[PDB]
Ligand binder design. Sequence first.
Ligand SMILES: CNS(=O)(=O)c1ccc(N2CCOCC2)c(Nc2ncnc3[nH]cc(Br)c23)c1
Ligand SMILES: CNS(=O)(=O)c1ccc(N2CCOCC2)c(Nc2ncnc3[nH]cc(Br)c23)c1
Lengths: 264, 257
Amino acid sequence: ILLLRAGLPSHFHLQLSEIEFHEIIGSGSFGKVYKGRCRNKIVAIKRYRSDVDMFCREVSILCQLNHPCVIQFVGACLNDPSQFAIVTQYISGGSLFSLLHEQKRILDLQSKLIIAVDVAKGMEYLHNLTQPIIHRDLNSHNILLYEDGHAVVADFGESRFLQSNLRWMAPEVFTQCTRYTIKADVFSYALCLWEILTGEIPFAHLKPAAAAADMAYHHIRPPIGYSIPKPISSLLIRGWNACPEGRPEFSEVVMKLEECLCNI
Amino acid sequence: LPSHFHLQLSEIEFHEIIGSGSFGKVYKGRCRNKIVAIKRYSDVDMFCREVSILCQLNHPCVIQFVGACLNDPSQFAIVTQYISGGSLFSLLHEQKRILDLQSKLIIAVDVAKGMEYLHNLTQPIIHRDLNSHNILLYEDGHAVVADFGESRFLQSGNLRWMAPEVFTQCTRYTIKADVFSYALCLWEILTGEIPFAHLKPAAAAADMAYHHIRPPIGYSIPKPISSLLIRGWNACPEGRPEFSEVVMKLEECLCNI
Ligand SMILES: CNS(=O)(=O)c1ccc(N2CCOCC2)c(Nc2ncnc3[nH]cc(Br)c23)c1
Ligand SMILES: CNS(=O)(=O)c1ccc(N2CCOCC2)c(Nc2ncnc3[nH]cc(Br)c23)c1
């Protein structure tokens, strides 16, 4: 916290008294997320309820980020653990999850791709920083939408910087010993991309742990209909390959989806 | 650790080296009037773990602990019974001895009983590193499980979009990992072949985990056993048998050998 207070540029340093908390817009064990106001901006605030090290990491990551497909950091409060809070821009159009599954708004192909492309661009950005960042929690809740249908990647509370005998191991043990890479994000993305196209929650009929289990152990993936365009189904098939190294880099995901926009 | 298990370096008479690795070296020797094997080695946490496991062990199909030296990090040493008949891996792959089906099953059942034992202790133990190097043979062709350096005591909505490799890492190890390992050992035993002989170990571990590859089952393997094998190396841990059931079926086979 002393190391952080020193390294984080001072313009980001916020006092809790500078923040006005309106509503709660999201929740969790970690803490709650309020809509509010700060330095004459409409903002979203994550407030916290090893906890120190989690918060110091998250700020260290957020303050690196500048890209129009990634949530815009505004500042944090670093006084003491009790005060701890994180502030970002607010985006009115709400989560992608809501759009698809609650409001059940029916989007056309162009609109869907724009979103897919924007998210891929944000991930590309993160993965190709000098010191790559893994989001590690990409989902339709953490894809937020501008009124005009563009999208940004949010919530870096699980994010980590990428760091710099097996013949008889059970697969799940072998997988524990292998440190995960930026490729984990691509797998999450793939599901998001299917979620967008179908309108459907992955394994909608299953509780989260069961769905994970099926993907992980029984190697199941959501159904790929014949009507899904080829270049996309390809990306899906590759993107959620159990073998991480077989998943495409986001730079290619972008390239392909932008092609589709040219042909849309 | 129980005071009687404490050992001083002077109580241990070293002889030749019998094994190696980045971890350290293993010696044959003599201690407290018995022929022994001696192992010699964040890094301290893992030693107490290994020792706290070994002292608990008391079963004919599991290695016998004898004691351990605790003076300082430089002096750390673990001492066990020495077993004259070498490693199974050797017998199978270097010596290449031809065994009857009975001899094979005797080893298979012995290893299974040792694993059963471990798994059904009040506070169960996962070996986490079973293989034909750590299966040691008595001259009479009985076998024991060895080398507990990797062994662990069993510990008591984002998940839906997680990559498998990440989900696996947020999940706690189970005893069913040993069952998978055993399956391979069992196939190895029956066929005499190293699993995926044509591949280097990581290539093998990848193919088993990602591309769901398993060893080939030919008429070389009997039907009742081959059912066990397939279930044993299931991708789903929960689909794999418990070692109790392995024992039953394999003893049932021994009745018919
Ligand atoms: C402090 N910002 S943050 O990036 O750490 C952050 C984390 C989580 C969330 N929620 C996302 C939806 O599931 C619940 C958590 C948000 N939410 C939002 N951030 C901006 N504009 C927003 N508009 C609507 C919403 Br909800 C919204 C921010
Ligand atoms: C201190 N005993 S221990 O259980 O920690 C232990 C760990 C590893 C090994 N080696 C096994 C073979 O690959 C290399 C490591 C052994 N070795 C042996 N222990 C008993 N009798 C033995 N006879 C022949 C051999 Br080798 C042998 C013990």
